[PDB]
Design a protein around this ligand. Structure first.
Ligand code: 4LS
Ligand code: 4LS
Ligand code: 4LS
Ligand code: 4LS
Ligand code: 4LS
Ligand code: 4LS
Ligand code: 4LS
Ligand code: 4LS
Ligand code: NA
Ligand code: NA
Ligand code: NA
Ligand code: NA
Ligand code: NA
Ligand code: NA
Ligand code: NA
Ligand code: NA
Lengths: 207, 207, 207, 207, 207, 207, 207, 207
């Protein structure tokens, strides 16, 4: 259940841990992942984590496959101008797409149709083909520029899913908070997850 | 520096820890706090924390004063229909106002001018007097209804500051994440804080 | 086929018979129903029908289970402030939601995001999770305020399904008219119904 | 009291019984009726009723006069391209106009100013002369296209009165439901009716 | 996979070959087709092709069945005012709908809700029932009137799929170009096709 | 007749054959062409054609001059950041400008004023000087993002001329289809062409 | 009085003399300046002035410090992708920001939220933190694209201060004109200047 | 080439030198000029220049004819309420119109259609007849009120040409700057000028 193939793009907002945890969960659910990452996101990851991600796609693909315990060819990695990759055309096989984290600059690019690199074109294709598109911005405050871009995209059917974890299961660790956002993304995609219980599911009637 | 008096309202989004930490920081900066809390927020706090907050304003005021180490009368607590309280009129002395957490229902009330209780009227007054108003929503996804309400209010000069902590100082605890959002709120108000360093302040020139 | 679980909310427009007939059909299709009812809707039902609906959720649940011939736990009843019930969070298991009848006040609440009670929050969650939301208003005239609220919600993907039965199968009773609207709701949800034939299904070619 | 002359147009939505009952009530209130009917409405009437309405205006006029017990010349019937009829020019004597039923296609024509036949031109004239215009759509769901057209026209002063009968007088027959809508139309026009009591008129003070 | 039943309407833009090729592919995928054609489209077909399409629905149905090699009753043909045909009511069994070619006049009719014939009403029903609607305009330049109509409909969930074939598989014939557009339509509907490969499907990693 | 100088920019939509055929026709009409091409368009041309276009402007200029049979200096080629070229300033001599093919990313850049390279700045100058600007997008579906960008630009006086060839002269080859679009572009510019007859020019009166 | 720290960005509009004169005045008022310059602005400066500005940030910093007579570390220079610099995060110490000259491309980037380099991100941060942002465009004509971008940003609280010097103090040199614009910028920031007298300050009453 | 007759209006923004230089260039190109000047512009000219312009139209006409070396009747001067002058009616012979300088008050009048004097009516006529209208505002900052007025007028086809001279030919005098704006106005009108070279005209290919 849910999509067999997910385009996962990481862009340069803070929150690299969310994208890595989501990649890991997707691999554990036996999904094929087309993995894309922006130059600024590579710097975020080097800044915020101890993951030493190689820069070139083939080396990055090898690295992420070992990091996640993925099967061979389960993770594809495509470079930022590789227009021969599936996500660049709506004639590709259907994927769901998630941008996590989603920088304000990528939010803006997708909202205006800029298509300046493969991540932006891929989201542009997702919208024109009416395939799932989930954006996970991380910023604060949100300015009116951010909010108008999110509103436009939500009105066009994108899911605006900010990295704003809930506290209602009493988190005990940073990892608990990361998992709550990742679980919400998986819920949105329709992919099984067991990190976030189904609210009130045992609640039969009011007190 | 910054406002001497802050109206701090807690409403029923998840994230009770943010409001309590902000209250604590405000008290430690010797600010007067006019504290307001919705019925649903009281349930969130009971659900997500071990804080046993008394229900009536006078008992709540005593409790919070001990919880924070506040001076006598530094924290005022007002009930949800107490139109005699300062926040209800623009002829009151100037306060900054923060709604943290800010539920989607309170976001909506403030965006449409509903003024159904003291928290909503207080924000309505803040906007009409052009006094600071900081809203800290916690929700995911944000629907187009949420986003249009945030956009309207941001366009009118409110600060939309979602509970979306950054990871770029490598948080080690839930408390580190809570402090990053609280530090941003204090920055927005112009109140000193030492939990979040000033980005790049020692960076003199590019490599 | 169609959703296993339906949140059915009744609010205070005239047309209590539509909600009761829909509840009955849903139970006969072996669906789980999370049943919600507003204080004004309780008065409509007492005014327009001979159904003596108990006021408290547990007694109401017992009553409706016998009224419909439902299996045990097939109908859940939740009170108007019970934020622990599944419909209040998008992390709940997926439901479709129907508000039938839908008062103009509830139409307005859902259109602005007011979330003042469980019915309003539940619809707010349905919209943010992109789950089905069917509103059945009953009013006449529709003012521009009603129409702008319906238009906003329809543009966001809600189904505006007014209680305006068709006459093209020559109804013979009030019950025939009620069934035509209920059949349309079930069609919209994708749930089998045999009260309303499929138009023109035997029509092979034009005369 | 109310208008002496009513242009009553029937167009091809389901609900032929509403137009016929309204015509009958208007005749019983000694009003002059300029009766117009679309080709699709003629098919609806043949489908949904046992009224065998002749096709040509003069024969239709004779038929409706006997059907209603009208006085001679009280009902005028005009064909769909008869630009010499009063409703086609604002220099005609003042009429109120009702389109009942109002198809979605006629709703659209009137909203955009299409004026493709006498019914559409007549409504266009009603709007430009600021004479009463009451539209009785019957459709479900209402799409955003329907809703934007109704909203535009309501904003211009038309009355959008959907065929959505209320149940709050406990209807016992289809005829009771038809009369509730017809009574609302007559109320809107300011014409006496005794089918629908005046709500709460004997209610002096609250319990 | 994909819809069992497709309403295929041809209207009077140039590109008759696209509609005929799509009809053929749909028949080869064992789909039921409800075929509709406008008077102007009949003239386009006579102008641009050597297909001698009979004018009356029954003869047209016989002709198209032989032209495509369809099974008996697989292709239904309905006339332009046949309101008894399934596409005219949302209570019909669910179809996807394609207008190919889509003239600018039909684009306009569907955008404003004109419902002047069965093709227009059928698309109006598709939108109100939230069933698939794919419009294939062929015009150049697109004026702002065309573009505002397409934008409105795309915002309401219609797919605007212009007859603008791609060249990236190096077409060798007019037929290759026609197949690229038809393949895109089938992709949009979710119907198998083998004329257009899935872009980059064998591309594992960037060079 | 028509402009003496045309800025022809090729960007990375499919349809490289259209730009090359247009360049050829312009040269055969003795027009001066300022030729610009994006990095992605160079990849399209290598993918979709057997034209081996050199990468550097001077070599590209030599190549295109031989390819077209142009006179010396009739084709100028400018690099993507060459702000000293005429198209970059409105104080240049007047040109008409055509972007053919026009990618969705360039459509977006021109619609928002991005001016990130010489093609984008050149179109920005064309709009501010009210000089002709013809955009030839090739995409399908057009999303609402594409359509809003085209609509904005058409409202500002740009010509949106999609690569959507007509079939009403019964094309026999891919080349016939390419020529129909190129002929429309030349018509739009006011430049003589003999590939597309003038519709109905010998038609004196209706049958 | 006025801000202690100013982010001064130069982008590629004509008017390099304005940015250099402003930098000089800021240094003479003992302000800290975080200096940013785009690649196109470097070409403008080389074209329009005899200032030989080194390309790398450290050499540029040394050069500008001598050019202005600045104290050590008073001018910081940051490269176009240096996300570790203060202006890139709202958690930095508060600055006012001026883009002078402001190209139409940078105007567009800031209006849409593109954040493609440090100048664009810095302005995006200024807007989200509600810190001063002054844009000094230099273009003529202003197209509707330019004007809509300026209007959006002015509505969000940016100051649109075009390089349009006044003549009402009878300028005698180009330098007089440059100083009038620079004086207006300093006035806007609240920084003392003595180049532009205060209009009418000695005017006590009308003649 | 270009218009034979120009309506040149001067209104009370700073920049009187621009209008006088433009008048002079127009006279040297043997154009007929219908010269209009507002009361506030007369005060600007007295303030900013040593031109002693007589107040009454006939004396002003004599003066300007000698100032420019104009032929007899080449410059017509019309008073501010002279509705018998050509510019007041669209039935006059075609002129291009320039308002230089254009005060913010005149910008506003023309944007709203105020027509309070001959300059405002003349621009209103230019817009309704679709004749050239060039506005040369001089103000800084531009407020959102200024920007919305300029945007409206630019969208209606007026040219918004702010007095914002470029520096890219290294001006040496105030006069050089004035000539750059005047040259742009003449370019916009299509009138020969030799003060501003054609950018890049000798640039054949990129380096
Ligand atoms: C401490 C800073 C600079 C703030 C947190 N953060 C962030 C952290 C780090 C450590 C780096 C380096 C960069 C950021 N940014 C800025 C962002 O990368 C820029 O807008 C950039 O152009 C994005 O481009 P892409 O869309 O990825 O192609 C960024 N952008 C954003 O939208 N949200 C963020 O949290 C942050
Ligand atoms: C697990 C649930 C139900 C989700 C997380 N969450 C939350 C947790 C708990 C534990 C409770 C009880 C309630 C919420 N809600 C719902 C919210 O309180 C309602 O909209 C309510 O009417 C708000 O009214 P006020 O504006 O405070 O007057 C709420 N609202 C919101 O905007 N964000 C939230 O995170 C949550
Ligand atoms: C004869 C009357 C008062 C009209 C028919 N009708 C109705 C019947 C009865 C018998 C009662 C008592 C109330 C109504 N109302 C009014 C409605 O309940 C109010 O707006 C109310 O606040 C709704 O709140 P909720 O959204 O349910 O929380 C209501 N509202 C509405 O939208 N449509 C209706 O038909 C009617
Ligand atoms: C079972 C069907 C097809 C649905 C109910 N219904 C209806 C019943 C019958 C039995 C017929 C024949 C037709 C309808 N229609 C379609 C409607 O007539 C078309 O839009 C038509 O062009 C209208 O043109 P006019 O505006 O009258 O000129 C129609 N239109 C509408 O707006 N509401 C309706 O209820 C229905
Ligand atoms: C060479 C002409 C006239 C242009 C190409 N073309 C076309 C070819 C032929 C050969 C015919 C006869 C007609 C067209 N038209 C005009 C179109 O049919 C009219 O708008 C007409 O009212 C459409 O009504 P419908 O929506 O079908 O009911 C039309 N309309 C359109 O939108 N795109 C087209 O390509 C063309
Ligand atoms: C099979 C693909 C990927 C689809 C057809 N096609 C295309 C073919 C080929 C073979 C390549 C390589 C690229 C495309 N693209 C994508 C496009 O180049 C990107 O948006 C790109 O950033 C454009 O940048 P520029 O505006 O030129 O600077 C593109 N873009 C577009 O708008 N229309 C197209 O047809 C296609
Ligand atoms: C004579 C020309 C080309 C006109 C005056 N001028 C200018 C002069 C020179 C000498 C150069 C080289 C460039 C310009 N430009 C074009 C501008 O740099 C481009 O839009 C460019 O992408 C800007 O990118 P950035 O925003 O700086 O990153 C530019 N842009 C602008 O907005 N205003 C200007 O005056 C001019
Ligand atoms: C130093 C001042 C007052 C600023 C520069 N300047 C100017 C200089 C002088 C010396 C005078 C006297 C007046 C101005 N004004 C104000 C302007 O004339 C008023 O809005 C006035 O009503 C205009 O009416 P009109 O449209 O001409 O009928 C004006 N208006 C404007 O739009 N731009 C300007 O530069 C200036
Ligand atoms: Na681009
Ligand atoms: Na209230
Ligand atoms: Na509330
Ligand atoms: Na007509
Ligand atoms: Na019609
Ligand atoms: Na740029
Ligand atoms: Na970017
Ligand atoms: Na006046």
């Amino acid at each position: 259940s849910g999509p067999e193939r997910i385009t996962l793009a990481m862009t340069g907002a803070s929150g690299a841990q969310y994208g890595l945890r989501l990649l890991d969960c997707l691999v554990q659910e036996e999904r094929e992942v087309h993995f894309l990452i922006s130059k600024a996101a590579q710097l975020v990851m080097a800044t915020e984590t101890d993951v030493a991600l190689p820069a070139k796609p083939q080396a990055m693909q090898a690295f992420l496959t070992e990091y996640c315990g993925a099967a061979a060819g389960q993770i594809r990695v495509f470079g930022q101008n590789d227009w021969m990759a599936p996500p660049a055309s709506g004639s590709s096989a259907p994927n769901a797409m998630v941008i996590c984290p989603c920088s304000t600059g990528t939010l803006s690019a997708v909202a205006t149709g800029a298509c300046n690199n493969l991540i932006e074109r891929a989201a542009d294709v997702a919208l024109k083909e009416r395939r799932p598109l989930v954006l996970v911005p991380r910023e604060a405050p949100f300015s009116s520029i951010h909010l108008e871009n999110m509103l436009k995209l939500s009105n066009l059917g994108a899911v605006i899913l900010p990295a704003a974890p809930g506290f209602y299961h009493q988190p005990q660790s940073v990892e608990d908070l990361v998992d709550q956002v990742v679980a919400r993304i998986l819920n949105t995609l329709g992919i099984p997850q067991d990190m976030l219980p189904r609210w009130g599911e045992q609640h039969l009637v009011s007190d």
